[PDB]
Write a protein that binds this ligand. Structure first.
Ligand code: HEM
Ligand code: HEM
Ligand code: HEM
Ligand code: HEM
Ligand code: L35
Ligand code: L35
Lengths: 141, 145, 141, 145
């Protein structure tokens, strides 16, 4: 479970992200497509090149889900319910992939948060992304 | 890295396999046990229940095709990457199949061999087949880009 | 994540295990050590040779913990609380190894319970082992 | 197998890595972010809090040794297996370290490089390092049995 300290750590990190959440979402997806090419198999309909508006638009949606997850950190299952239906029953992204994107979101945060990305905050964020991931796959079977 | 005894263990058991039955069985169980793998098979008709998935002739037909190619690859255990190159390219470039699906089907196939062969699927026989399903999955993932 | 039908399926299948629990546990572990040699890094203190009393005894502890889990499928976090602590704080087995033992338990049940291992029971047992796994790694961090 | 331009992104970035500092930093983070990894460092003294872990001199010392070996490895990107064979045997037969830990350390190191270097740690540079850290972990896993 997310501890009170984790919840505090996540909120302060995401707090400093602030208005750049969208941008960072898009960067994390780019990082993922390049680091882990198999993740591209979910996107044969997108132009995945650097700067792609489809990646920027998707990145903004991913980031807003996370902003929503942080704002309902005590109540994530419900907040993400529509997204967990959509991944379980339509997109059907293999659960392995959430770990890849989590790592890439963590890297993006690290690369933009020189003060805030302390060992403890890094620990809380990984927990928080594992947790979002878990909720997002909780309806898969 | 299969040993000489591990290869002949693999070959020995496979000579007893009805590929088309085992294929339809394994692909069926894939879609049942890991339902998100159904994403590729919208055109296949009824997948509403375990029985419907197992019964569906298209599931069986595709199962026969995949395990047939798997079967043919057991003649080339020292070049799985080579044998599976063009199919790797196809699953990446046209089919957009996440190579994780190869790993899941690999472990489903192991469950099916164990069910089918019982006692005969011994712990050393399993270990040999695990190297096989790893190798085939890795090989089919190899040309992804 | 465990539906009522999963719970019926698991109880049915595992009820058939019965007095073989010890033996099936031992077999799963042996399947694990031979199939996934990295798992042995957790047992350098054991005679891991075939038929070793250390592996039979351990097999029986794992099987009995599973029986406990089945008998309390509604309340697994509680029933497995001590075991949870032990793996989190002392044994500290990397979580990936639970997938490897689960898959080996599934193979064992498959090779031993041919009438019971229907596709739906297969999916139910897999979900069950994944659920016990999640319980056993609940307190890791 | 890393591409030539991935080799040179790796090389260029590493020229600026203080190996001692980054090593200490990455091992410390491993032990904080994935605290079960502490199971290998029972004799290391105080690991009770993030601050204790990060300032622990034995953590820092060992972190220098580990990343130093990693560093040496970056001169042999075409034969990570041969380069790490002896440490692979050591880590299996003497230390009993589950090779999954190499993967976790790989990913912590990537986060450290990103944190430390910021925007210079571009998505192409990251991609090249991912291949490196998978190669290293694979090579360190290679002689397990
Ligand atoms: C942090 C975890 C994730 C979050 C928060 C997330 C969130 C979202 C959101 C908010 C949407 C848009 C839904 C809508 O249009 O109503 C979406 C769609 C989508 N996601 Fe996920 N997602 C995550 C992980 C993943 C992963 C790992 C993959 C595969 C690599 C993936 C593949 C997709 C795809 C293919 C779409 C549809 C894109 C389109 O065609 O517009 N997602 N996700
Ligand atoms: C043992 C591993 C596998 C092998 C050896 C294999 C082999 C094959 C072969 C030989 C084809 C025929 C393509 C053609 O006619 O050119 C094919 C197509 C296909 N495969 Fe795979 N496959 C494997 C696993 C999978 C998995 C796990 C999935 C997804 C769950 C998948 C999805 C597909 C799809 C959707 C097609 C196209 C079928 C069609 O057009 O009707 N394959 N595969
Ligand atoms: C199905 C999931 C698992 C269950 C239900 C389970 C259960 C148990 C039980 C009941 C014990 C004995 C506790 C006691 O003596 O009080 C034990 C100990 C232990 N387990 Fe777990 N376990 C599981 C997974 C694993 C995995 C995946 C590994 C590593 C590959 C592992 C490694 C160990 C080790 C090293 C011990 C101490 C054994 C000894 O020295 O006696 N376990 N486990
Ligand atoms: C980047 C991959 C890694 C490399 C290249 C590496 C390299 C090394 C080296 C060079 C040594 C010292 C050899 C000697 O004593 O003569 C060592 C020792 C050790 N390593 Fe690894 N290491 C890696 C990852 C890990 C990880 C992730 C862990 C566990 C979380 C680990 C656990 C240990 C332990 C317990 C020792 C013995 C420390 C002691 O003497 O008390 N290593 N490693
Ligand atoms: C029980 C607990 C705490 O275990 C764990 C939680 C997180 C991780 N990290 C990951 O695997 N990272 C990871 C990162 C990449 Cl790029 C690829 C892959 Cl394949 C994995 C490992 C274990 C949990 O699941 O919450
Ligand atoms: C969300 C949901 C349903 O996803 C999943 C649950 C289980 C699995 N099975 C596996 O990983 N098997 C598996 C088997 C082996 Cl030999 C090795 C490894 Cl590395 C993995 C995959 C996805 C869940 O986590 O419960």
């Amino acid at each position: 479970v997310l501890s009170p300290a984790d919840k505090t750590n996540v909120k302060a990190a995401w707090g400093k992200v602030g208005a750049h959440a969208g941008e960072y979402g898009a960067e994390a997806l780019e990082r993922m497509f390049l680091s882990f090419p198999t993740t591209k198999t979910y996107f044969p309909h997108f132009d995945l090149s650097h700067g792609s508006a489809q990646v920027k638009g998707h990145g903004k949606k991913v980031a807003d889900a996370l902003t929503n997850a942080v704002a309902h950190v005590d109540d994530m299952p419900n907040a993400l319910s529509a997204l967990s239906d959509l991944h379980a029953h339509k997109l059907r992204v293999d659960p392995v992939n959430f770990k890849l994107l989590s790592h890439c979101l963590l890297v993006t945060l690290a690369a933009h948060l020189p003060a805030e990305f302390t060992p403890a905050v890094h620990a809380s964020l990984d927990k928080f992304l594992a947790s979002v991931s878990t909720v997002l796959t909780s309806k898969y079977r | 890295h299969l040993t000489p005894e591990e290869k002949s263990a693999v070959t020995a058991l496979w000579g007893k396999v009805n590929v088309d039955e085992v294929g339809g069985e394994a692909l069926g169980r894939l879609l049942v046990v890991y339902p998100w793998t159904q994403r590729f098979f919208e055109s296949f008709g009824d997948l509403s229940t375990p029985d419907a998935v197992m019964g569906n002739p298209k599931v069986k037909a595709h199962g026969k095709k995949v395990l047939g190619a798997f079967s043919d690859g057991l003649a080339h255990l020292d070049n799985l990457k080579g044998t599976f190159a063009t199919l790797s390219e196809l699953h990446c470039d046209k089919l957009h199949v996440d190579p994780e699906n190869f790993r899941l089907l690999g472990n489903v196939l192991v469950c099916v061999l164990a069910h089918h062969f019982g006692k005969e699927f011994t712990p050393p026989v399993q270990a040999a087949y695990q190297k096989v399903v790893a190798g085939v999955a890795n090989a089919l993932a190899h040309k992804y880009h």
